[PDB]
Amino acid sequence: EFDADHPLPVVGTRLNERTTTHKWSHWDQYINPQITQSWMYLTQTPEYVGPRSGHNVIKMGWMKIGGSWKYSRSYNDARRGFAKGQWQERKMTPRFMLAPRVSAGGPRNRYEGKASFSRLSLSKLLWAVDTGRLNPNETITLYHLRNAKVIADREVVWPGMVLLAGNVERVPYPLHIELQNASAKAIQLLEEAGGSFTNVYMSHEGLYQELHP
Amino acid sequence: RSDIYDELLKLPLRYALHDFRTLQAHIHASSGLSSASPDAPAYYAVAGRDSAVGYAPPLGPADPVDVIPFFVHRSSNGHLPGKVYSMNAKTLMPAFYMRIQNIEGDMFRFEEELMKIFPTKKIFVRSHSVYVYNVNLDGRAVLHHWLLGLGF
């Protein structure tokens, strides 16, 4: 308004006269929790926009439902699913068949009795010992590592572990460990600081009775 | 790293950072004993006193007169709240975003201190976290060199 006496009229537009009631956003309920007054106010994560509402037809954007199926000639054909039990490559000598079989079991196969350890980076073990999950006095056999939630169940598969001096240029205190197959540097790191490392290599029958004695 | 710490020591940041040398956990019985108080009586040390990995309690506030308006807690295992997820891991897309998950305070006076760091990364604020986009594991390293400088 150039002058206050002639106020600009309120003649609404399609950006005012067509709105909706303000539901409470997760900020307006974070400020003033005095308004979350029913479970219809606990609306989902903002990232969850809502259920799928359109046909993501390939080669043509995301079509609406009830839209035109002139161009979904291959969406009706990528909804059945990939051929099951059938070569993916219809012509052109599949790239797998072209390459030669190597190492009759495979290039990284694990047979019954393979020596493949899960890597317990020394930084992890050194990080714990100061944090206070591990006691530096007691020779830190894998029970302590498992029960102190340093390593979970999903990482101790036979045989137990492998100590890896990962970026650890120094170990400050005399540290004793009973683990399985430390790396040669990880050994010469503990052994410099007056520690020990007596690599226990237990059978599977021994792997149990050490974790659940 | 000192090389990154300049890219914070250069910034026009309120809430100044600790000097680098005093921010270091990494430097007279026998030319001075080790850090973790192994005293002269046959060397009894104290457990959580020295750490070769780099763990240490928060150094504390920047300077006494100022009051920092955000507080970034530590995780249950010690390290800091920065996590670098990826857009659309299912397709293994190499376009990453960070997430600052364990903070309390006013994220906006926290996020308004990330903007001065990354004047080009889209930063969004949410109730618990602070998403900053297009910043990968090197940005993860810039944060902690800051969240240590702030004294958390």
Binding site: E169, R170, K185, Q188, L189, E192, A193 | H26
Partner: peptide
């Protein structure tokens, strides 16, 4: 290279405490 640059008489294996010549002394600079 590490022992000479430190003016030290040669040593090998040069154990890991001595290696990283007391924080890889930075070759005095």
């Amino acid at each position: 290279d590490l022992c000479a640059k430190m003016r030290l008489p040669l040593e090998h294996p040069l154990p890991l405490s001595r290696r990283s010549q007391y924080a890889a002394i930075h070759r005095v600079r």
